[PDB]
Amino acid sequence: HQGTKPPRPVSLESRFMNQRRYDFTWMHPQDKFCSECRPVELECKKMCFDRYRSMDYRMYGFQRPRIQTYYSFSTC
Amino acid sequence: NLEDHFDLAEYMMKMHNPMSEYLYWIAGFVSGLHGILPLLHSNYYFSGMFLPRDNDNTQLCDDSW
Amino acid sequence: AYNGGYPFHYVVQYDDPNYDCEADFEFEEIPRDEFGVPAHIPPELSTQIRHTYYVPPQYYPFLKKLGEDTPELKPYTDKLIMGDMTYDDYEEMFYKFAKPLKIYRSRLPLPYRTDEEISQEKYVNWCGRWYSYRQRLQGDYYSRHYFRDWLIGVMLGMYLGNLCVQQHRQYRVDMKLFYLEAPEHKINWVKPRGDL
Amino acid sequence: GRELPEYVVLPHNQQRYGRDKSYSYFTCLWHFPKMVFTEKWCYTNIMWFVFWTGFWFIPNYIWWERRYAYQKAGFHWEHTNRKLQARKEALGMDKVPASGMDW
Amino acid sequence: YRHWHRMSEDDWALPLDSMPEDVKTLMATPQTERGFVEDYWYNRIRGEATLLDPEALPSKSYIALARDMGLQIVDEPSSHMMGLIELYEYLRGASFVGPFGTIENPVLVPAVGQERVVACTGGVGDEEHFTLWFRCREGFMYRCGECDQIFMLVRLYYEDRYWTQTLVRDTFMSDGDMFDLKTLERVHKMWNKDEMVRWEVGYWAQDYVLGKGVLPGMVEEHTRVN
Amino acid sequence: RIGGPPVFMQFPPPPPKEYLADGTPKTYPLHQPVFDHGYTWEHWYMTNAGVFHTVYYGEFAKDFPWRWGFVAEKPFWVGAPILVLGVLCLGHIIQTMGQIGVRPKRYTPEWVEATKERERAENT
Amino acid sequence: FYILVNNNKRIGIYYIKLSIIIGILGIVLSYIIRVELYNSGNRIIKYDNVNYYNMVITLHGLLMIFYIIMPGLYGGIPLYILPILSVITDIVLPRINNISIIIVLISYIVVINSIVIEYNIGTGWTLYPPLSIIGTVIVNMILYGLIIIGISSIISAINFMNILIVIDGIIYVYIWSIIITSVLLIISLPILNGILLMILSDIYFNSIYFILNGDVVLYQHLFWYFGHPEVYILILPAFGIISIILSVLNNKIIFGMKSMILAIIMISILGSIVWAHHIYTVGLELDTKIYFNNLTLIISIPTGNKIYNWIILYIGSYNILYNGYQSLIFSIMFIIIFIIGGITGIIISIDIIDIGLHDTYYIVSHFHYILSIGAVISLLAGILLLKDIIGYYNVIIKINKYFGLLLFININIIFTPQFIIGFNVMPRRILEYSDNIIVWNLISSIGSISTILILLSIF
Amino acid sequence: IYEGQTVQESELIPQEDDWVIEETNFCLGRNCYVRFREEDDLARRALHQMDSQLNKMHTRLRDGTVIPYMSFHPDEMVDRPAPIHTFSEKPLLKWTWDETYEEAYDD
Ligand SMILES: CCCCCCCCCCCCCCCCCC(=O)OC[C@H](COP(=O)([O-])OCC(O)COP(=O)([O-])OC[C@@H](COC(=O)CCCCCCCCCCCCCCCCC)OC(=O)CCCCCCCCCCCCCCCCC)OC(=O)CCCCCCCCCCCCCCCCC
Ligand code: HEA
Ligand code: HEA
Ligand SMILES: [O-][O-]
Ligand SMILES: [Cu+2]
Ligand SMILES: [K+]
Ligand SMILES: [Zn+2]
Structure with a gap:
């Protein structure tokens, strides 16, 4: 079920939604990877890792299609 | 042993080295400085003076000194 | 009635003389209990079976001598001779003949006291009783005096409190006359200053 | 089992210790600094503490200063990016292979 | 006692590998010169030698039988000491409650040292008062300042030593006739024959008297791997 | 319990006494000074020594420095009142040293009158 | 070590x-x-x-x-x-x-x-x-x-x-x-x-x-x-501590021991359910305010029982015993001082009174009288009682009537004026204030410098 | 509440007409700071301190019994200053009851 979780509507940014006082850096106090992305926001991190790779900095993850990997639980 | 009967035997028997007392007082003195030194440093950092002159943030008479 | 009936310490027997429960990893040897009951016979059944101690017959004359010298011990020795003594019977015999250790006060050395001092024991007891009599009476006397005094404090605290009641009373009278008669009360007087 | 005498006569005849001399309120103001600068056991313990605390402070200090200067220059990826633009300028190529990869 | 933890295996019996290997000297050592392990195995070897000889038991007196098993015949001196020892041990983890103390019968306060802290709570009911703590030093008949309860310190002291079960046994028990090794051998052959050992302690003990490794299977019994 | 921490053990004898080469007993440091001053008063106080006893505790002037010997010699109600005023006066003096000659303009007569005008207008 | x-x-x-x-x-x-x-x-x-x-x-x-x-x-x-x-x-x-x-x-x-x-x-x-x-x-x-x-x-x-x-x-x-x-x-x-x-x-x-x-x-x-x-x-x-000192120094058995104990238990239970008297001005519901105000006033009952049980401990004690020991004076001073702090606590407990007195120096003086005076003196009194057992020396405190008097007088000079400025009113947690509050603030300041000077005399 | 021990009139009757209340001083004596000798070393000053304990003192009555230094709490029972290990032998709080058993007596 989690491997094929249905897409959900993009959240409208309501009155008290997505409030930020400072960037997200508690996971990487010194490196400060993906300061704009949230700790487990996988799609934001993927695009952020792509920027770093385009800047000659290697990052791990978000490159193999799900159906071409083992244990994905997303194969037909 | 008789020397080990009392806790802190040297101090209780009045033979301890005075340096122990001096260190205790020095430690307290250093603790006190943690309230005064940052006061002076912060005053200078934001004003340029280590300590103010009484009522120098208000309008003063011409002859005030 | 302790530890669920499991004895903290118990004897186990093994048929093979060279068997070691820690070195060997075979799966055919069956351990026995102290009476020799194989482990595959459950406790509920084996505990019902009656087990009695069998001593070699050469001991019968000794067990007979014990009974005669101590007649209270004879019934237990007879059971042992006749092979009718269970573990419970042995326990009853064991605890029946256990006696407590005795302390003799006559053997205790005494703190030193002269014969002159020993003759004054009644006098000192007499003084102690009079001290307890005087103590008990004084308790009643003091309780009456001081708890009565506390009333003076109540009355002093009621007088001083009443002074503020009177001030408050006059205050309320004055307040009622402010908006009614006081020239200090002014209306159509304060004008807005306006923004600076 | 050890055998000891009731008393021992010392070789020297110096009465080094005894009752305190009468002291005033501010006696400590001169006695304490005197001990620090004149008693060996005191100033050898101070120098030992200062020397070794500073000794291990240096390697940490050097490492952090280099790290701090680096962090102010930019993020890790901003550094690798500057070396990538330089390599693109050296070759005159708009797009170059990523580091560790061939054309 | 309630304050003691669970019996050990050793509290019941000792392993035969703790038997002294010089049995000949062990059976000749005076009781005052035997240590705890040596005294355990002296009594067990000698006691089981007499118990495993049925034909001689009926003719043996209780005085002699008790000596062989290592049991001390009781007397008023030893009973007093043992009793005060057990009373001291009980008070280690138990409350101290008893009759009101008077000059004729002071409260007995056992101690090893020369002093023990004691509290007087007075009498029963309304005669009970708040705890009044005092230091009970030896040689003084103490009187509570409040209820006049008399106290006294009892010291478990004997000849530069305190009172222990070992001390009581050494001071009052007297060594009897020296143990005869012929009895050990005679009983050994009685219960141990043709590869059957019905006196394991006497098979090991006889082996040591023979010099260790002499009896069948004993070399294999003494060969260990770690 | 055999071989456990003993309930009681006797103190071993103290180490041998030390004499100087001339035979004078060797003295060791002692923080019980004999202060030098002219005061010799001796104050005694009945003290609780438990429930049924007391002890007559004495304080000797020579056991204290000069400052305490001087103060403790006088009657309490002679010294106490003077000391109370003195400490208060000193506190005010200390707090006045940093404001010598400071003349804020809001305490001048002109500003004092202007506040009175404001109070009249606002009926404060 | x-x-x-x-x-x-x-x-x-x-x-x-x-x-x-x-x-x-x-x-x-x-x-x-x-x-x-x-x-x-x-x-x-x-x-x-x-x-x-x-x-x-x-x-x-x-x-x-x-x-x-x-x-x-x-x-x-x-x-x-x-x-x-x-x-x-x-x-x-x-x-x-x-x-x-x-x-x-x-x-x-x-x-x-x-x-x-x-x-x-x-x-x-x-x-x-x-x-x-x-x-x-x-x-x-x-x-x-x-x-x-x-x-x-x-x-x-x-x-x-x-x-x-x-x-x-x-x-x-x-x-x-x-x-x-x-x-x-x-x-x-x-x-x-x-x-x-x-x-x-x-x-x-x-x-x-x-x-x-x-x-x-x-x-x-x-x-x-x-x-x-x-x-x-x-x-x-x-x-x-106060209970031990009074009983020991007066040679009197604690009166109402079980009531003392049950008073301490009661204060704890009640103290665990009255916290919102610190939140009176936020705008809580009327019934909540009334509950908390009611239960807050109840705490005085068990606290009052302890105070009166202490008083009878000092009453009736033998006159021959010297009463000028610093530990005894501090223990007695605690009763006198704690009542002041507690009574002012009951005043602030009334929420309507609290509207005027929240975040003012009246609250300061209230908890100072209990802590800065009462708790400090209790700790001093306890240490002083155990001077022989602890064994410290090189101080002149055990019998020092000057220290006790000067401390009591000057500590009150600091915090008594802070009750007055609470109806003036001078907010808390501020440094600048109107010129018409200087008098009382100045008096308290003179008290603070003086107390510090008295701390030097003990050595 | 505690009001002292109960007294029967028979116990207040003297054996002589001159009996009065014994006038024994329960003030232990005059004391001050324990004064150590300079000559004494650390071990011998420890012995000196142990010999100046007020809680080891008592008052002997006319019949030879002594009323000891007593306290409401056991805090006053340890040596002053407190040694490292105080109550090696467990202090015994003595409770009294009327129960008895025959083994304790002999006829
Ligand atoms: C509220 C206040 C008023 C209160 C009033 C009321 C009081 C009522 C009574 C209360 C009583 C409470 C109970 C008391 C029980 C006492 C028991 C006792 O004595 O125990 C024994 C115990 C130890 O005795 P012992 O058994 O002989 O011990 C032997 C040693 O173990 C072994 O001996 P050793 O010689 O081998 O010792 C080793 C020694 C070896 O020592 C040496 O070698 C010393 C050498 C000399 C050094 C001297 C200092 C130098 C400083 C230089 C500074 C330079 C600054 C330059 C600035 C330039 C600027 C331009 O030390 C060390 O190696 C380590 C020392 C560490 C501790 C000292 C730390 C100091 C401060 C450090 C600050 C650092 C800040 C860093 C920040 C960094 C930021 C990046 O006693 C003590 O420790 C002394 C206690 C003394 C006071 C007792 C109480 C008396 C009564 C109260 C008096 C009033 C006090 C008021 C407070 C103080 C006010 C200031
Ligand atoms: C140990 C410290 C201590 C103690 C004991 C108390 C005790 C009490 N306190 Fe507390 N209090 C504080 C420390 C303390 N307080 C602190 C530090 C703050 C401020 C924290 C902050 O805001 O930052 C504070 C704040 C505080 C406020 C907040 C006021 C405000 O924020 O504006 C209130 C009001 O309810 C209050 C009430 C009480 C009450 C009702 C008691 C009761 O316990 C008092 C009980 C005692 C008595 C009542 C006197 C003795 C009893 C009698 C004499 C019996 C007879 C009396 C009667 C019948 C009434 N306290
Ligand atoms: C128990 C805690 C405690 C103690 C002792 C004190 C002591 C003192 N406090 Fe207190 N104070 C607080 C707790 C305490 N205070 C708290 C919790 C606040 C509110 C914080 C806030 O607003 O956020 C406060 C706020 C506070 C303010 C308000 C500042 C403001 O917010 O605007 C002021 C000044 O007016 C003040 C002054 C003093 C003074 C002059 C003393 C004392 O100096 C008076 C003189 C007494 C002594 C100098 C003796 C003290 C000695 C000891 C404490 C050591 C005892 C140790 C042993 C006995 C071993 N305090
Ligand atoms: O807080 O009361
Ligand atoms: Cu509160
Ligand atoms: K200001
Ligand atoms: Zn009594």
Whole structure:
């Protein structure tokens, strides 16, 4: 079920939604990877890792299609 | 042993080295400085003076000194 | 009635003389209990079976001598001779003949006291009783005096409190006359200053 | 089992210790600094503490200063990016292979 | 006692590998010169030698039988000491409650040292008062300042030593006739024959008297791997 | 319990006494000074020594420095009142040293009158 | 050794020693505050450095509460006499006792280091959000200190509770006082930790509990659910000491021992359910306000019973015994002073009176009379009673009538005027004020400098 | 509440007409700071301190019994200053009851 979780509507940014006082850096106090992305926001991190790779900095993850990997639980 | 009967035997028997007392007082003195030194440093950092002159943030008479 | 009936310490027997429960990893040897009951016979059944101690017959004359010298011990020795003594019977015999250790006060050395001092024991007891009599009476006397005094404090605290009641009373009278008669009360007087 | 005498006569005849001399309120103001600068056991313990605390402070200090200067220059990826633009300028190529990869 | 933890295996019996290997000297050592392990195995070897000889038991007196098993015949001196020892041990983890103390019968306060802290709570009911703590030093008949309860310190002291079960046994028990090794051998052959050992302690003990490794299977019994 | 921490053990004898080469007993440091001053008063106080006893505790002037010997010699109600005023006066003096000659303009007569005008207008 | 020692009596001495050291920093901060408040203007803090004053008042409060009085009355005297009162050889948990004092020292070093290195800003000792969560890193450091202190407090509470399992005598009133404080800590600390973690989450983990649609009043509930139990965790050990001193020095058995014990238990239960009297002005519902006001006034009943039981202890005592000992004077002074603090507490308990007196110096004087005067004097009196047992010397305190008189007079000069300015009114946590409040502020300031001078005469 | 021990009139009857209340001083004596000799070393100053304990003192009555230094709490029972190890032998709190058993007596 989690491997094929249905897409959900993009959240409208309501009155008290997505409030930020400072960037997200508690996971990487010194490196400060993906300061704009949230700790487990996988799609934001993927695009952020792509920027770093385009800047000659290697990052791990978000490159193999799900159906071409083992244990994905997303194969037909 | 008789020397080990009392806790802190040297101090209780009045033979301890005075340096122990001096260190205790020095430690307290250093603790006190943690309230005064940052006061002076912060005053200078934001004003340029280590300590103010009484009522120098208000309008003063011409002859005030 | 302790530890669920499991004895903290118990004897186990093994048929093979060279068997070691820690070195060997075979799966055919069956351990026995102290009476020799194989482990595959459950406790509920084996505990019902009656087990009695069998001593070699050469001991019968000794067990007979014990009974005669101590007649209270004879019934237990007879059971042992006749092979009718269970573990419970042995326990009853064991605890029946256990006696407590005795302390003799006559053997205790005494703190030193002269014969002159020993003759004054009644006098000192007499003084102690009079001290307890005087103590008990004084308790009643003091309780009456001081708890009565506390009333003076109540009355002093009621007088001083009443002074503020009177001030408050006059205050309320004055307040009622402010908006009614006081020239200090002014209306159509304060004008807005306006923004600076 | 050890055998000891009731008393021992010392070789020297110096009465080094005894009752305190009468002291005033501010006696400590001169006695304490005197001990620090004149008693060996005191100033050898101070120098030992200062020397070794500073000794291990240096390697940490050097490492952090280099790290701090680096962090102010930019993020890790901003550094690798500057070396990538330089390599693109050296070759005159708009797009170059990523580091560790061939054309 | 309630304050003691669970019996050990050793509290019941000792392993035969703790038997002294010089049995000949062990059976000749005076009781005052035997240590705890040596005294355990002296009594067990000698006691089981007499118990495993049925034909001689009926003719043996209780005085002699008790000596062989290592049991001390009781007397008023030893009973007093043992009793005060057990009373001291009980008070280690138990409350101290008893009759009101008077000059004729002071409260007995056992101690090893020369002093023990004691509290007087007075009498029963309304005669009970708040705890009044005092230091009970030896040689003084103490009187509570409040209820006049008399106290006294009892010291478990004997000849530069305190009172222990070992001390009581050494001071009052007297060594009897020296143990005869012929009895050990005679009983050994009685219960141990043709590869059957019905006196394991006497098979090991006889082996040591023979010099260790002499009896069948004993070399294999003494060969260990770690 | 055999071989456990003993309930009681006797103190071993103290180490041998030390004499100087001339035979004078060797003295060791002692923080019980004999202060030098002219005061010799001796104050005694009945003290609780438990429930049924007391002890007559004495304080000797020579056991204290000069400052305490001087103060403790006088009657309490002679010294106490003077000391109370003195400490208060000193506190005010200390707090006045940093404001010598400071003349804020809001305490001048002109500003004092202007506040009175404001109070009249606002009926404060 | 020094740091390795596990002796419970040595550790008790360490707690008192550290409380005095940290106390020097506490008193210095208090002198800064009173100096500043001597007149209107800037005196020792620049107008551009007003953030320092906010930090001074914040650290003063935190240090005196958690690093001085609590380590002194719940760590110092308790660790030294409790195992003796329980006729037990030593404390149940030896190794835990050692680490507790080390933890306190390490958290103190973190706090003072944060003064030196971090920017100096303040948010009160009550760390109300959102102000606490929009500050600089010094707030993060202070949070670490509190959490670390919480660890030491809870493990010490566990240590004292285990005495019930080993006590070989009678549970005296003092032992009951510590046990109940330990219970109050075991039940209140876990709630504090949770709310502190939420402050951290908003400071350091981008949480949103204290931004709109999240109720900031939530923090005040959880904080004060620990806050008020804390004020009784700080006073109950003092009550236990007062009972011992009065009974011993007057040679009189405690009267109503069971009522004393049951009064302490009652205060604890009630103190665990009255916290919102600190939140009267937020705008709570009428029925909530009435509940809390009603239960707050009930606490006076058990507290009153203890006071009167103490009075009869001193009444009737023998005249021949000298009554000028400093310990006896301090114990008596506690009754006289605590009644003042408690009565003013009942006044502020009425919420309508509280509207006028919230966040004013009347509240300051109220809790100073109980803590800065009552608790301090109780700790001094307890240490003084144990002077022979502890064995310290080189001070002139045991019989010093001048010190007691000067302290009592001058301490009242500081805080009695703070009750007056509460109806003037002078807000709390401010440094500048209107010129018409100088007189009373000046009088209190003269009192502060004088008290400090009297602290030098003991040596 | 505690009001002292109960007294029967028979116990207040003297054996002589001159009996009065014994006038024994319960003030232990005059004391001050324990004064150590300079000559004494650390071990011998420890012995000196142990010999100046007020809680080891008592008052001997006319019949030879002594009323000891007593305290409401055991805090006053340890040596002053407190030694490292205080209550090696467990202090005994004596409770009183009327129960008895035959083994304790002999006829
Ligand atoms: C509130 C206040 C008022 C209160 C009034 C009321 C009081 C009522 C009574 C209360 C009583 C409580 C109970 C008391 C029980 C006492 C028991 C006792 O005595 O125990 C024995 C115990 C130890 O005795 P012992 O058994 O002989 O111990 C032997 C040693 O173990 C072994 O001996 P050793 O010689 O081998 O020792 C080792 C020694 C070896 O020592 C040496 O070698 C010393 C050498 C000399 C050094 C001297 C200091 C130098 C400083 C230089 C500074 C330079 C600054 C330059 C600035 C330049 C600027 C331009 O030390 C060390 O190696 C380590 C020392 C560490 C501690 C000292 C730390 C100092 C401060 C450090 C600050 C650092 C800040 C860093 C910040 C960094 C930021 C990046 O006694 C003590 O420790 C002394 C206690 C003395 C006071 C007792 C209480 C008396 C009564 C109260 C008086 C009033 C006090 C008021 C508070 C103080 C005010 C200031
Ligand atoms: C140990 C310290 C301590 C103690 C014991 C108390 C005790 C009490 N406190 Fe507390 N209090 C504080 C420390 C303490 N307090 C602190 C530090 C603050 C401020 C924290 C902050 O805001 O930052 C505070 C704040 C505080 C407020 C907040 C006011 C405001 O925020 O505006 C209130 C009001 O309810 C209050 C009430 C009480 C009451 C009702 C008691 C009762 O316990 C008093 C009980 C005692 C008596 C009543 C006197 C003795 C009893 C009698 C003589 C019997 C006869 C009396 C009657 C019948 C009434 N306290
Ligand atoms: C128990 C804690 C404690 C103690 C002792 C004190 C003591 C003192 N405090 Fe207190 N104070 C607080 C806790 C305490 N304070 C708290 C919690 C606040 C509110 C914080 C906030 O607003 O955020 C506060 C606020 C506070 C303010 C308000 C500043 C403001 O917010 O605007 C002021 C000044 O007016 C002040 C002054 C003083 C003075 C002059 C003393 C004393 O100096 C008076 C003189 C007494 C002594 C100098 C003796 C003290 C000695 C010891 C404490 C050591 C004892 C150790 C042993 C006995 C071993 N305090
Ligand atoms: O807080 O009361
Ligand atoms: Cu409150
Ligand atoms: K100001
Ligand atoms: Zn009695």
